[PDB]
Design a protein around this nucleic acid. Sequence first.
RNA 1: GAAACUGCGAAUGGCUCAUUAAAUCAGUUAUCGUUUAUUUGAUAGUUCCUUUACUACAUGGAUAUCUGUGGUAAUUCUAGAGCUAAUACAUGCUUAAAAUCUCGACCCUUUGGAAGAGAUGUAUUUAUUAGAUAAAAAAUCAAUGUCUUCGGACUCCUUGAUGAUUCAUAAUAACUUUUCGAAUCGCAUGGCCUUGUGCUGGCGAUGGUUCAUUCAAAUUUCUGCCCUAUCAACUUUCGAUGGUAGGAUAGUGGCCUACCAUGGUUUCAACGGGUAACGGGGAAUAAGGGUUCGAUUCCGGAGAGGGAGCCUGAGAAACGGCUACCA
RNA 2: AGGACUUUUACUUUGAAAAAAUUAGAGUGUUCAAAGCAGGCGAAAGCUCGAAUAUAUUAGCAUGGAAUAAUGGAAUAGGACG
Lengths: 188, 155, 53, 260
Amino acid sequence: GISRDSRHKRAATGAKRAQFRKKRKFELGRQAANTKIGTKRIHPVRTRGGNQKFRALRIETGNFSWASEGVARKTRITGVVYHPSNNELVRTNTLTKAAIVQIDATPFRQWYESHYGQSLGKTSKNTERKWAARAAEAKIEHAVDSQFGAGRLYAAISSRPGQSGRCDGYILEGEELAFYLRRLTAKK
Amino acid sequence: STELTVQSERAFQKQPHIFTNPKAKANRKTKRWYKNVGLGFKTPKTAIEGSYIDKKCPFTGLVSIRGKILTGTVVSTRMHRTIVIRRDYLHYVPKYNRYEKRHKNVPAHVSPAFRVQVGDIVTVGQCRPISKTVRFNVLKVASATGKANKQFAKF
Amino acid sequence: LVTPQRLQRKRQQKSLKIKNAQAQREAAAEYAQLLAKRLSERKAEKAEVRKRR
Amino acid sequence: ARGPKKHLKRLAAPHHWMLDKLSGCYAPRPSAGPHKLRESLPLIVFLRNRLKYALNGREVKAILMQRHVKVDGKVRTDTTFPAGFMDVITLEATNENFRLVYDVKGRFAVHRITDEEASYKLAKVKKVQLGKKGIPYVVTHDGRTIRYPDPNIKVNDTVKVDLATGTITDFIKFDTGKLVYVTGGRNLGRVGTIVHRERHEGGFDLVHIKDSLENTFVTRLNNVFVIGEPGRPWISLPKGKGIKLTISEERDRRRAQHGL
RNA sequence: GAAACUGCGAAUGGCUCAUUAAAUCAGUUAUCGUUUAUUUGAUAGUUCCUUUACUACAUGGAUAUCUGUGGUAAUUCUAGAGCUAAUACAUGCUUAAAAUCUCGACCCUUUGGAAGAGAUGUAUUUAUUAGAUAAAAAAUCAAUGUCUUCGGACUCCUUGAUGAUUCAUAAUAACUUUUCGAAUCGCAUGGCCUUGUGCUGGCGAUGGUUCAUUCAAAUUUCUGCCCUAUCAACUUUCGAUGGUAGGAUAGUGGCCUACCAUGGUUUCAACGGGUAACGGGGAAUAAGGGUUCGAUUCCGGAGAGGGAGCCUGAGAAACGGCUACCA
RNA sequence: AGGACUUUUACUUUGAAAAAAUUAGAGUGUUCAAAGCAGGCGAAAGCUCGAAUAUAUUAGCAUGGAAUAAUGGAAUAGGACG
Ligand SMILES: [Mg+2]
Ligand SMILES: [Mg+2]
Ligand SMILES: [Mg+2]
Ligand SMILES: [Mg+2]
Ligand SMILES: [Mg+2]
Ligand SMILES: [Mg+2]
Ligand SMILES: [Mg+2]
Ligand SMILES: [Mg+2]
Ligand SMILES: [Mg+2]
Ligand SMILES: [Mg+2]
Ligand SMILES: [Mg+2]
Ligand SMILES: [Mg+2]
Ligand SMILES: [Mg+2]
Ligand SMILES: [Mg+2]
Ligand SMILES: [Mg+2]
Ligand SMILES: [Mg+2]
Ligand SMILES: [Mg+2]
Ligand SMILES: [Mg+2]
Ligand SMILES: [Mg+2]
């Protein structure tokens, strides 16, 4: 019943448009997903022209990508720490797009260990030669090592759990992280 | 009317899906994406090397220019990130064989790459519905001043 | 129930799938050879342009 | 209206089907198919009206059902099939073959055309795209999606479908000085040569056309269909070859060619 | 061949002009801003997951129709029992090769180079990359690749479309309460002889993923509306104008939310009021200019007593579809 | 067929467009006409011409013209060329 048509809005001038053509079905708007954390519970909604949509309320784990070396891993979302739209969602732990969350960060950790093996937080000859050819190029920046020692990664979700049903995003990295940590220090 | 900070608001401002690799040691300013709107319209160098973001930029944003191309005169440059253009014309009343001066107010969205002010004639182009009322993106400031190119008088 | 007509239909479906796959791969190979021929021709033209200029 | 519309009132039918404004409240709405209904021609109209082989709807239904009509080598047993421009209608009885080309008055004229050339069809290229797994394909005006075309076949071009296998036989490249047909507007049925194609940056290409009688006009590029090289059309042009004789010239033709 | 299940239409058509004055509508654009049953043209080997033990010569259970027992005063009211089917509901099998990615039982001193092992169809979601291209030569440093007829040469690099794109498409990493990839029907039942129910085998009908095309549907640019100032300022705390992010949308969009900015229209008549106003194609009238009408044979829009709300579908805020209030 | 700069209009010619029905109007003995898109001609042995055109005066698109009407250049030269 929630319409999104322009008739109920006043005109650009400001006149109050008279009621006309009681609102249709191709103008409908559905309830917000306002997703939460834990006990995966995705509800299908049959939208216009089939095309099953998936509400992703109560979602706990999802895929997350690392842009620098470009590797994606399934990992757990552990709470939301910042939201650019409303801090009310942060207090209620409501998870929507562009929200900033914390990551269990283990899968990235032993992927790094089996990939470079630099022992963050503090063999076959083929792997040794791969590492030698690598020649310590893994000079990834300092803040990501800081929260690796902390153990929880700072990520920004990029998927839309309200529509897609997934919980995908990417880790804050580079000046990105910089910006947001300032904001977090504003919160701190 | 433009903030000194390249991002001023709470949300971060990035061009979506263009990524600068921090692990790389090239250390250029950033990776700024851009395009030319065509129609033989020159992308401004202020947009070419600029640092603004402007999601709805015809040159750097996702919006595309297609359809009507309207030339008008600026009547209000003094609301944020958007312009109000006065388009004048003559409606032909045929019962008298006489014309009638008329005007319309077209809202549009001027990119920060352009420096607009009250009185500049502007070429603007059609695009997607950007807001409730703006449907055009400013594409050229033809008359930057018009009669204010020369200001002082020192012989 | 198992009927020789049903087995005939199953065999027809399988054979049609295999034959369509073979035809598609043959068409892909022919298009690749045509692209190679065209590329060789225009590369020879480019070499002649470079030599003449 | 809430949903699609499935009725075509008689006055709302195109004036090229040119039915009788009386003797019926409705007109045959062409079913969805290879051509726009405004541009297409239902089989019932082509048989009952144009050919008069039938008398009414039941007769057309009986004709189509027993598989005597063959549109482009396929049966098409539905009454309101949109047999559009350049399609081939084959009747094994009377062993006759028709190709739909506009007569210069601008109408789907009955064009009796030979069996040997009826094996193939011509088509305009409306799109050239790259489908999944990187396979190039070409979309013609019929909606035929021909896979693996010639690498230098471009949009607005013309091509020669063999109509049996449905693949690419030959093609003609759109450029100046080329025999051409017109498929819309005031210049329906006209045939000429492309003199110039003004680009018009931003949309709605236009082309200038000069016919054999040395008359000149201009038409939109969407409205244009290259048909061959001057003096060598790739099809059999209808009677009159679309010169668009003046009304006074038509009167002179009526007066001169006259025997009773 | 009744009945019933299944499938499809029932959203077309027909009627009326009540609401509606930049609203509808007309002409003209746009969708590089989206959904699209159907029709038409194409479209997929991988469903194996360690393949040295499986139904693929066919997997399971209900369920209407029906047989019988009722209830109510009655309604296209149906509860209990007993069987029974599918293109209904559920599962699920083959099945190649190839190439590309990843991980190594070793050796032999570099140009290191190799036994071998797992994944890769499509669909979805997210990150990243390619998607080029104005034109002749260099030196150098590093990295370090081919061949070396051991001087060193590197000569060869593939790239579609529009006016424009983050487009089409391809590639890597992953993701999925894992979509599809024919356990379906008719006719004719030919050929091979491995002469058996063996091997194959034609014409169709329904389905079926994706991409097109068509019928469209939604929005959408410019301009155009009758009378009235005894309607001059109107709109914004409750969105009014704009910004950003999110939600919702099929999709753009204050369409909604959160936080900001204080904006937008107006003497070129905004806003308000009236219309015994649906808009138009057109009708009457006719020197020319015009005046009046247009509820109605065509195109659009809206409505089914007034209001709201919604299931099914591709398409309804349907009303010869339901839910509730008011009359 | 490509880079390059484009003073901008108002005006006017031409064209593409302005759905059919309606208006105009061509052909045609519906027995005439209102109408309709029919029909006509063979020897009677299948052969046929049709279903013409114009206008819409606004808005948009293209195009040729440069009088009439308006705006803009170079005055601090920050002007034009090599
Ligand atoms: Mg209707
Ligand atoms: Mg009013
Ligand atoms: Mg890229
Ligand atoms: Mg893409
Ligand atoms: Mg938004
Ligand atoms: Mg009324
Ligand atoms: Mg009316
Ligand atoms: Mg009226
Ligand atoms: Mg009334
Ligand atoms: Mg109507
Ligand atoms: Mg209704
Ligand atoms: Mg009543
Ligand atoms: Mg249906
Ligand atoms: Mg209703
Ligand atoms: Mg009724
Ligand atoms: Mg009804
Ligand atoms: Mg009902
Ligand atoms: Mg008309
Ligand atoms: Mg008359």
